């Protein structure tokens, strides 16, 4: 196998504070097929004006 990095020497993991309300925001983002949002180009063949 391989080692990504040497084992951490930290005595303890850094403190983390979780607040769901602050993170939550109203930002609706509907994916649009007309704007080809998040659409994968066909890997099998390239296409012209057709």
């Amino acid at each position: 196998y391989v080692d990504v990095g040497p084992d951490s020497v930290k005595s303890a993991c850094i403190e983390v504070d979780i607040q769901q309300t602050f993170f939550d925001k109203t930002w609706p983002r509907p994916i649009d097929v007309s704007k080809a949002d998040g659409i994968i180009y066909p890997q099998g063949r390239t296409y012209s004006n057709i």
Partner: antibody
Amino acid sequence: QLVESGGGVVQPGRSLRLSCAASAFTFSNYGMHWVRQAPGKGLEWVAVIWSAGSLKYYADSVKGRFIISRDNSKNTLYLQMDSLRPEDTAVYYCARENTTYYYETSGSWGASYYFDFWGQGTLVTVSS
Amino acid sequence: DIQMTQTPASLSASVGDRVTITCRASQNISSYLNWYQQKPGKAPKVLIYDTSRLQSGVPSRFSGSASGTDFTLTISSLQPEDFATYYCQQSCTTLRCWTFGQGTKLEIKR
């Protein structure tokens, strides 16, 4: 508040039950554990357990003789002592243990320590 | 193994006296070294947590400085009430075992 109960005179080589109960405290939020002291000897330790309770730590003097089981809903910690000896006789204190963890990006540190409500302690005597 | 010794098992000092108490570990295994003062019938109180920052609720007169493996605690304006047994504990996350202070008694000199 951590209070230890069930401490009493105990016959040698018998199971001894010690219960430490946290009052108005969330057992799951902080690891809650123990520590020990005998006359003529320095304040040593007894037993540290994680909030999950998977991690087990025991005093060097006892080779796993102490057994620690805790339930967060129960808010109580149970310690079982076996092969009791006159030297083993001591007063046991149960207290939650905390450490300070932070990254000094700009001299930044947080104490994050809760040694408050340290256990008063109970005395178990091995005598016949 | 790890060997810990305190230079004075019992120390006698007058009131308003300047004294140093030193506890020596086998080696400085970890940065965090905590000094504890114990009063009989009372729970142990941590004088200092890492010997670099004084613990909250602890008087400025107690100062902990560690040079080499040995750690020195300096006290000034000593009081009969102030005198108490002193224990030093070395805390390492890697090592399950916790160092135990010898317990240096402090008494009035007259």
